[PDB]
Structures are given as C-alpha cells and as structure tokens.
Design a binder for this molecule. Structure first.
Ligand code: HEA
Ligand code: HEA
Ligand code: PTY
Ligand code: PTY
Ligand code: CU
Ligand code: ZN
Lengths: 117, 100, 535, 48, 58, 126
C-alpha cells in the first residue's frame, strides 16, 4: 500500500511489504508476489536473520539476586520453565517473572528478571 | 548413589553460603527429604545460618522436625544432649518449653 | 452482532469447550432419566409402568446406550478437557484448524434431533445398541427409525475424525521453543493415543453401517443368508470398532488421575516413560483383539485359544499404571480434598470391575456368562465408576481456574458419598443375578429374580438425588462464588510446607509442573503474545 | 472487559428475571423430555 | 489493467474494514441465493419431520 | 512495641486489618537483630505464631463442625430415597404366582422330580 522494502531495516509494519509485480508470460518468483508474514521470513532468510527464534533458555549459570538471569519480553510477563543448571537436574518448574517482582524457583533457587524491550 | 559422608559435606557447603531467608528455608526443606537423617554437624551449621539471617521461628522449627524424622524417643534425646552448647549460647528455646 | 461473532461464529478453542460442557450436561441428564425409567420397571415381577409394551423398553435401552456412549462421555472428555487444556499445556495460542473445531461442535445438535426423532416416528428403534442385521431389517423394523438412528452415528463419526486430525496436527508442530516430544505432559499423550485409534477404527464402522443401510433399503443382500451373505460379517465389522471405542472412553481419564495424584500428594509421578509406554501398549493391543465379544457364534477351536491368549495380556500394562499410582501416593503427604476423594475411589473400583474381565476372557467360562447380567455388572463398574468419576474429578479440579468462581466443599462431599453409596448398591447384585442365570434385555423375569431387583432399584433413586445436588452445587458456584474462597482452605492449590512460613508463602503461592495454574484465572482470550521458554 | 463473568454465554448478575428460573427450566426440560416420548408412544399403541 | 491485479487486490483485502467473505463487489451474487435457499431447505425439513410424527403421509 | 500489642496474639490476629499487621512484623524484625536472651517470652511466642501457626493457609480443610454436617447431609439423602421407593412399593401389580399357597404347590413338583439335590430348592419368599 506504500513504499516497498528491500532489507529488514526498512520494515515498519505490514504497509511496507507488498512488492513489485510479475510480467505477462512468466511464472512469478516469491520476491515478486508475497505480502504478509510470509515475505518477512523471506527477507529474513536471504540475509541470515532468523525472525522466529527457536533457541532454549540459558542453562549455564545460576541466579543470584544481585546478578539475575535477564529474560527478554515485549510484555510485562513471560512464562519461564526451569529444569536446572546442568540442564536436566531440577524437574520442570514454571515461573512468571514480572516488571515488579522476580521469580526464584523454590527447588534450586535461580532468580529471573524481566527485560522489557 | 550418594553416601553419608558426601551428603554431610554437600549440605554443609550449601548451608554456609545462603544469603536470605528464602535460601535458608529452601536448603532446610530439601535436607529433610531424603532417607538419611541430617548429621549433628549439619544442624549445627543450620542454626548459625539462621543466626546470620536473624530469624527465630526457623531455629525453633528445626528441632520440631527432628522429632518427626527420628524413629524413636531415645535417639531424639541423644540428639538433644549434643546440641546443647549450641542452644544455650545462641538462646534457642524448644517448643515444649515455650508452650505456644 | 457481537453475540453472534463470538459464540456462534467462533475461532477460539477455549470458547467451544464451554459449549461442549453445556451440551454434555443435557445429554447426560436425558439418559439418566431414561435409566430411571428402566430401573423402575425392573423392580418387582409383573408389568408395572409400561403397561404391556415390550417396545418402548428396548427403545429406552437403545437411547440410553447411545446418549451416553456418544453424547456424554466423548464430548466431555474430548471437547471440554481436550480443546481447552491441550493448547495451554503445550503452550500454543489456538488450534491448527479452528473452523474444523467449530464444525466438530456443530455436527452434534443435528445428531441429537435425528436420534430424538428416531423414537417418535414409529414403534421405534428397538434393535439394541449393536444394530444386528437380521433383526434390523424390513421384516421387524419397517419404518424411518433405524435409518434415522444410523444417520446419527455418521455425524458423530465425522466430528470425531475431524477433531482427532486436529489434535494430532496441533501437537506435532505447534509447541513452544524448548519442548521436544519427550517432555510433554501425560494428558497430551492420552489425547494423542486416543486420536490415533479414532483414525484407525471409524472407517470400519462407517462401512458396516452403510452396508446395513444398503441392505435395508436398496435390496443388496450383504448380510442376508438367502442370497449368499452372512450376518456374522457385520459382527466383525462392528467389533473392530467396538473395542478401540471402549479404550477411547478410558485413556483420557487415566491422565487426569495422574495430575491429581501428582498434585495433592506432593510427589512427581513414578516412572513417566513407563506410563507412556504402557498407554502405547494398551492402545496397540486393543486392535488385535475383537472376537471375545463373539465366542458363542460357532468359531473354530484353534481361534478361541488365540483370543484367550491375546486378551489376558492387556492385564500386564494396566498393572504398571496402577502400581505406579500407588508408588506415587506412597511416600508423600496426602490432604483429602474433593478431587482426591474421586481419585481414591477410582483406583479401587476400576480394579474390581477390571478383575471380572479376566473371568470373562476364557472361552470355556464365557459359555456360562454370555448375554447375562454379569457382563452388565462388569462394564458398569468400569464405565459409571471409572469414567464418570474421572469426569467429576476433572471438573472439581479445573473449574476454579477456568471459571474464576469457587464452590462449597461440604455439598460436593455429600454428592460424592451419595454417588458412592447408591452406585455400589445398584451394580453389585447384578453379579449374583448373573451367576444364578438371568439373561439380558428382558422386561419381565421369573419370580426367583425378584429380591435383588428390589435392591438395585433403590440405589438409582440415591444417585438421582446426587445429580440434583450437583445441580445445586453448580448454582452455588455461579451465584456468590467470590465469597466461597475463605470458607475452607480447599481453594488453595498447594499447601504450605513444614519450613515454609506463611509470610513467605503469600509472596510465592503457586508451585506447579505445567503452564495451567500460573495463568490469570479467567484465562485470557489471547493468552500467549510472546512465546514461552523451556530450557 | 476480561473478568470472572466474561467467558460464559449467559448473563448471571444484574438481570431482570432472576437466574433461578433459567437455571431450573434447563434441568426441568432435560428431565422432562424422555417422559413425554414415553407418553406419546404409549398413547399411540392403545394402552392408556 | 493487466492480468497482474495481484498487486492491486492485495492492497484492497488489507485495509478493508469489512469481513473477507463480503469485501469484493461480487459477493452479493454468491451470498444472496445461498442464504436464500438455505432458509427454505431448513424450513422444509422442520415441517416434514413434524407432520410425520403425527402419522400424515404424502 | 508495647506489651498490649504483643501479648495474646492468638485471639486477635485474624481480626486486625492488613495495615496493622505489617507494623507488628516490621517491629519484630528490628527486635530480632538484637542478640537473643534479650527477648521477652511474649515476643518469642508471637514470632512463632506469626510464621508457623494455625492461621491463614495452615488451617485444616475439615473442621470438627463440618464432618457432622457431611454425615447428617448423607443421612437425609438416604432417608428421602427410601420414602420415594416405598411409595413405588405399595402400589404394585402383584401377579397370582406370588403367594405362599402357590409356592408350596411348586415345592411338591420340584420334590417329585428331584431338583437341586446338592444345595437347596425353596420357592417360598411370600
Ligand atoms: C469400559 C471400558 C472397558 C474396559 C476397561 C474393559 C476392560 C476389559 N474388557 Fe471389555 N468390555 C467392555 C469395555 C471395556 N472392557 C464393555 C462395554 C463390555 C460389555 C460388552 C457389551 O455388551 O457391548 C465388555 C465386555 C467384555 C468381555 C465380555 C464379553 C462377553 O459378554 O462375552 C470381555 C471378555 O473377554 C472383555 C474383555 C476385557 C478385558 C480382559 C478387560 C481388561 O482390560 C480389564 C483389565 C483390568 C485389570 C486386569 C486390572 C489390573 C490390575 C492388576 C493389578 C493386574 C493383575 C494381573 C492379573 C489380573 C493377572 N470385556
Ligand atoms: C455410558 C456408560 C453407562 C452409564 C453412565 C450408565 C448408567 C447407568 N446404567 Fe447402564 N448401560 C450402559 C452403560 C452405562 N450405563 C450401556 C452401554 C447400556 C446398554 C446395554 C444394551 O443396550 O444392551 C446400559 C443399559 C443399562 C440398563 C438396561 C439393561 C438392559 O436393558 O439390558 C440398566 C438397567 O439396570 C443400566 C443400569 C444403569 C444405571 C442405573 C445407570 C445410572 O448410573 C444412571 C445415573 C447416571 C449417573 C449416576 C451419572 C450422571 C452423569 C452426569 C450428570 C455427570 C456429567 C459429567 C460432567 C458434569 C463432567 N444400564
Ligand atoms: C469428508 C470430511 C473430511 C474432509 C476434510 C478434509 C480437509 C483437508 C484440508 C484441511 O485440512 O484444511 C482445513 C479445511 O480445509 C478444507 O478443505 C475444508 C473442507 C471442509 C469439509 C467439511 C466436511 C463436509 C462434509 C483448513 O481449514 P482452516 O480454515 O481451519 O485452515 C485455517 C488456516 N488457513
Ligand atoms: C457413614 C455415612 C457416610 C459419612 C461420611 C462422613 C465422612 C466425613 C469425614 C471425612 O470426610 O473425613 C476426611 C476423609 O477421611 C478419610 O480418610 C476417608 C477415606 C478417604 C478415601 C475414601 C475413598 C475410598 C478427613 O480429611 P482430613 O484429612 O481433613 O481429616 C483431617 C484430620 N486428619
Ligand atoms: Cu471387548
Ligand atoms: Zn529450578
């Protein structure tokens, strides 16, 4: 509906992802026909940027109240599941960090803080 | 797989590094959740840990859990004739002497 | 217009579960009144309430079978607990095919209308639940009754198939960031293993029912022995659906019990991998046996010996689940709240009703028990006391989280004890009547079978009073339910520990092993904006 | 408007006719239909 | 213009303020006969299932 | 930190509001920093009752006056069904065979043609 993007640095919404058109007598390419959340993945994967992350939790270091593990979220809450520092010792315990309170994991003891982006 | 002399060192090391009341009660809660009763040395560390964080009710509730973990009555009184200079220096009173 | 686009034209998976619950309550009330009609006729010898009509006795039995095999237990255990809890446990926003969820709901009210209209246009459909071919032809039932009753078993089949494909497709690729398919909870595995049997069993039923229809009305003679067919073929083509079906009713119950045993006894489940392998073995060995319902039809002598061997093997995986539940309840602390009462009353009565299945598995002993009330007493201890108890336990477990309104504890306990006493009075003398020799599906009986029939007519009137008290419990939950959380400490999900102080406990209240009990309790319409994280 | 009486298809509080009548009529119909069916099929077959 | 109206209808189905099934100026021709005849098909099977419970045949 | 504020908290703690409860806890937490053997007996009892005591989330699920309620609710659920079932018991269709003078004639036929030799035969149930 507006100016078309070339890289994901110029994408301020769904209004920048329509694209140019194909020509008469040609099987069209995906860079000439894609609109929604499909073209956003396409413009991510031709550079090396993974838009939808699939990397699990940090299971290296514990959590002190002075130095807590920072969990990043775009909301005021995010559900965090702890299962240990050697990554399978602690059982599955779920926690909800909030911007006003830190979770502390009643069995092993790691502290989680929320980073609001 | 864990033996008595490794349990009674690992829980001493864990009790000598707690910084808040949540952590002291956390290590105290999973110490009384095994088949091994705690040693008299571990309980002597737990009362100093409760002294650093300045709590009184937890130092009483440790001695109340020993009455439930220990099988008989003679072993409970054998625990209380060795944890006596710890009690009369810090000042901890048992539940049956307070009558709360 | 906002009413229509949100409760009739819907996409949200959690808003169809409440409609499934409201439908299941109605279709479990109708069948229970139909059962009270039957049990008030089988009271003393003679012709008491139905004046001389032996039709409108078989119709009532058929419609009491269909309304609670197909319209109560499956919508409650698939629609209310599967659609609602599985996205929240695996961590997804909604289902993969939401419009198929909407059609899987809305195929059922047209299936109720045809079944209720199969009992008013004619004498009726008194063929039994198993609609056997040479009775349900055009020489005994000549009218639009059997035809409209086998069209109510097509729409339910389409709904179940479309729900099962949705359940399998959702759990494969709509999980959170850190869940492999070995960290899943046990209820998701129960729904997966019932959804595979729903794929592998329902085409055979659809084929057999359609060929019965073609025999009735297009004179084809698949199952008529004057043209070159056998009725026994239909029995094969029925019972290959029949025995997967009766595990479909019971596998979603098992996982529910596990959660309660994991919660109110503060211990994890003993051997979870053994439990999922046991459910897999039970699901696989329910397809290789179907002919133990037919030992008197005239089979070979080397075929009965296979089906006695392949039937008693299923006792081995179920014992693992029972003994693992005992090992889970052994060491920990137990507080007796109203889900754990139903949990404790399920581990004993499923065992009693299931030990009778080993006696009936032998082909030599089935000559004395076939078409006898011992079979009825066997499967009522497992259906009414194994599945309905799991449904009540699941309701009393998950209803404060879904609804946000609590309930009175005392009235729920009175309801539980009334169900226990009345149902144990009702179905226990059926074993004695079976051992003495009373056949099935008879309105009138010889005078020797009178006395126990006086006692089994007394427990039904106890159970209906418990149903009415359950209705009042729901009414007391909906009105003034905000003020029913300080009466008792049952409202707490988990109790304070020995060393955990009250001041510490009020700051950190909920300790869980799933995503379910940490949500705000009305669950939000869009409950996950940012994804969940598991290590 | 998310809250404890928002996910249910029926209105419970601040209502003209009190909730006891729609709660009772639901169960009344549910335990009254299969007696009507027996009444119809009894009267169509001669017996009272 | 050309057969690539794909880059034109993708600026219409986005920013529409109507639902998808009634957004184009052609959905009248599909939606009026369908909902018209559905209300006759349903109203004919609720007259012949109530006439038939009373024993009346044709 | 007066004696009246501390002594006998076992009968007043659940009635105080949540702004007069957070002042006693924040006044016993600057009194525990002192070395013990300098605490009064009432403060030792109050510090035990505030954290480890039978108030709030440590109440039992069933009290003594609730099990009586459940018992006398089940009894008046069994009495009603007995009175309903009795009404469907007086008004019965009793066939002619259920009489004692008819079930004594059946015993002679079952005696002449020897039936139930091992256990028993008896058709008499009035
Ligand atoms: C409700 C679901 C359900 C369940 C769980 C079962 C469970 C079993 N059923 Fe099925 N069965 C039905 C549904 C169900 N059945 C129905 C509805 C009927 C009536 C048919 C109708 O008329 O349509 C029927 C009837 C029926 C019959 C009688 C058929 C006839 O009338 O002749 C038989 C006999 O082979 C049978 C087999 C079994 C067996 C062996 C089990 C076993 O799985 C039971 C297993 C339970 C245990 C064994 C407890 C385990 C405890 C242990 C500690 C193990 C100890 C080990 C030993 C005992 C060696 N069933
Ligand atoms: C679905 C399993 C089921 C259930 C629940 C019941 C319920 C009952 N059944 Fe059984 N019964 C069958 C299985 C079941 N039955 C089957 C399959 C047949 C047909 C056999 C045939 O056709 O050959 C049969 C038929 C049948 C007959 C007729 C036998 C015949 O004609 O040969 C009789 C008579 O004694 C009887 C007994 C009872 C009684 C007294 C109840 C009472 O328990 C009824 C009272 C009901 C309740 C106690 C539960 C109420 C449920 C709810 C309201 C809870 C809703 C849940 C949520 C809120 C989550 N049943
Ligand atoms: C015969 C009954 C079973 C046939 C259904 C097969 C459906 C296969 C195709 C499929 O799974 O897609 C779904 C239905 O599509 C469809 O193909 C719709 C078919 C619906 C047929 C309903 C049965 C009528 C008889 C998507 O449905 P979705 O809208 O949720 O996808 C939402 C995201 N785009
Ligand atoms: C006789 C007619 C029926 C009357 C039943 C009255 C039962 C009321 C008593 C009751 O519910 O007790 C709870 C269950 O106890 C039990 O232990 C009952 C057994 C529970 C399993 C029953 C299923 C079989 C105790 O519960 P509580 O733990 O709060 O008692 C706290 C003290 N210890
Ligand atoms: Cu079977
Ligand atoms: Zn942890």
């Amino acid at each position: 509906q507006f100016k078309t993007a070339t890289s994901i640095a110029e994408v301020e919404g769904l209004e920048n992802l329509v694209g140019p058109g194909a020509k008469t007598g040609t099987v069209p390419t995906d860079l000439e026909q894609a609109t929604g959340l499909e073209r956003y993945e396409l413009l991510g994967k031709l550079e090396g940027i993974e838009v939808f992350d699939e990397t699990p939790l940090e299971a290296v270091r514990k959590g002190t109240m002075k130095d807590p593990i920072l969990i990043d979220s775009y909301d005021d809450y995010r559900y965090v599941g702890c299962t240990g520092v050697p990554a399978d010792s602690h059982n599955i315990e779920w926690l909800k960090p909030t911007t006003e309170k830190n979770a502390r994991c009643w069995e092993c003891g790691s502290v989680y803080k929320l980073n609001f982006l | 797989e864990e033996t008595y002399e490794e349990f009674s060192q690992r829980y001493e090391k864990e009790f000598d590094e707690a910084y808040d009341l949540f952590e002291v009660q956390r290590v105290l809660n999973n110490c009384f959740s095994y088949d091994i009763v705690p040693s008299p040395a571990v309980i002597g560390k737990a009362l100093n840990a409760c002294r650093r964080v300045n709590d009184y009710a937890t130092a009483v509730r440790v001695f109340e859990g020993l009455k439930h973990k220990v099988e008989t009555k003679e072993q409970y009184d054998a625990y209380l004739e060795e944890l006596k200079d710890v009690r009369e220096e810090l000042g901890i009173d048992l539940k049956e002497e307070l009558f709360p | 217009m906002n009413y229509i686009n949100r409760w009739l034209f819907s996409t949200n998976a959690k808003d169809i579960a409440v409609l499934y619950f409201i439908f299941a309550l109605f279709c479990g009330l109708l069948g229970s009144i139909m059962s009270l009609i039957l049990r008030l006729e089988l009271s003393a010898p003679g012709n008491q309430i139905l004046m001389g009509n032996h039709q409108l006795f078989n119709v009532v039995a058929t419609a009491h079978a269909v309304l609670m095999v197909f319209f109560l237990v499956m919508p409650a255990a698939i629609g209310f607990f599967g659609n609602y809890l599985l996205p929240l446990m695996i961590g997804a926003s909604d289902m993969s095919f939401a419009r198929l969820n909407n059609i899987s709901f809305w195929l059922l009210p047209p299936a109720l209308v045809s079944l209720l209209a199969s009992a008013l246009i004619e004498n009726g459909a008194g063929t039994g639940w198993t609609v056997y071919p040479p009775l349900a032809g055009v020489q005994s039932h000549s009218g639009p009754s059997v035809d409209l009753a086998i069209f109510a078993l097509h729409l339910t089949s389409i709904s179940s198939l479309l729900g099962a494909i949705n359940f399998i497709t959702t759990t494969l690729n709509m999980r959170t960031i850190g869940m492999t398919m070995s960290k899943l909870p046990l209820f998701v595995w129960a729904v997966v293993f019932t959804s595979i049997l729903l794929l592998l069993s329902l085409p055979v039923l659809s084929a057999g029912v359609t060929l019965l229809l073609l025999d009735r009305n297009f004179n084809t003679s698949f199952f008529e022995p004057a043209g070159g067919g056998d009725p026994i073929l239909y029995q094969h083509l029925f019972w290959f659906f029949g025995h997967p079906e009766v595990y479909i009713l019971i596998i979603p119950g098992f996982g529910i019990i596990s959660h309660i045993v994991s919660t109110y006894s503060k211990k994890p489940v003993f051997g979870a991998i053994g439990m999922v392998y046991a459910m897999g073995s039970i699901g696989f060995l329910g397809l290789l046996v179907w002919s133990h319902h037919m030992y008197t039809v005239g089979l070979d002598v080397d075929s009965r010996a296979y089906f006695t061997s392949a039937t008693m093997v299923i006792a081995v995986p179920t014992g693992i689940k029972i003994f693992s539940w005992l090992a889970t309840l052994y060491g920990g602390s137990i507080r007796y709240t109203t889900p754990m009462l139903y949990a404790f009353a399920f581990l004993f009565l499923f065992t009693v009703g299931g030990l009778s299945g080993v006696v009936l598995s032998n082909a030599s002993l089935d000559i004395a028990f076939h078409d006898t009330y011992y079979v009825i007493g066997h499967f009522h201890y497992v259906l009414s006391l194994g599945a309905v108890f799991s449904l009540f336990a699941g309701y009393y477990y998950w209803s404060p989280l879904i609804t946000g309104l609590y309930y009175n504890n005392n009235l729920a306990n009175i309801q539980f004890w009334l169900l226990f006493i009345g149902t144990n009075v009702t179905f226990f003398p059926m074993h004695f009547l079976g051992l003495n020799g009373m056949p099935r599906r008879i309105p009138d009986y010889p005078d020797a079978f009178a006395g126990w029939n006086a006692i089994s007519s007394f427990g039904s009137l106890i159970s209906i009073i418990s149903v009415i008290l359950f209705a009042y419990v729901i009414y007391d939950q909906l009105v003034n339910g905000l003020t029913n959380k300080q009466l008792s400490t049952n409202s707490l999900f988990k109790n304070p520990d020995f060393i955990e102080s009250n001041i510490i406990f009020n700051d950190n209240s909920i300790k869980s092993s799933s995503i379910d009990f940490l949500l705000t309790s009305p669950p939000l319409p869009h409950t996950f904006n940012t994804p969940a994280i598991q290590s | 408007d998310v809250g404890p009486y928002s996910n249910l298809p029926f209105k419970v509080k601040n209502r003209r006719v009190p909730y006891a009548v729609p709660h009772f009529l639901f169960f009344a119909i549910g335990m009254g239909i299969p007696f009507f069916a027996c009444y119809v099929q009894l009267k169509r077959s001669g017996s009272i | 213009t050309a057969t690539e109206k794909i880059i034109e209808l993708q600026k219409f189905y986005q920013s529409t303020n109507k639902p998808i099934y009634a957004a184009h100026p052609r959905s009248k021709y599909y939606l009026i006969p369908y909902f018209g005849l559905l209300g006759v098909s349903v109203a004919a099977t609720l007259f012949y299932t109530g006439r038939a419970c009373f024993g009346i045949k044709d | 930190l007066s004696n009246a504020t501390v002594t006998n908290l076992e009968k007043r703690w659940e009635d105080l509001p949540e702004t007069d409860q957070k002042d006693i806890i924040s006044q016993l937490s600057e009194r525990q920093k002192l070395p013990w053997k300098d605490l009064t007996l009432s403060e030792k009892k109050a510090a035990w009752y505030i954290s480890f005591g039978e108030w709030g989330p440590r109440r039992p699920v069933h009290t003594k006056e609730d099990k009586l309620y459940i018992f006398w609710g089940t009894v008046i659920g069994i009495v009603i069904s007995a009175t309903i079932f009795g009404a469907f018991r007086y008004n019965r269709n009793v066939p002619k065979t259920m009489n004692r003078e008819w079930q004594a004639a059946s015993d002679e036929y079952l005696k002449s043609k020897n039936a139930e030799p091992f256990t028993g035969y008896s058709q008499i149930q009035s």
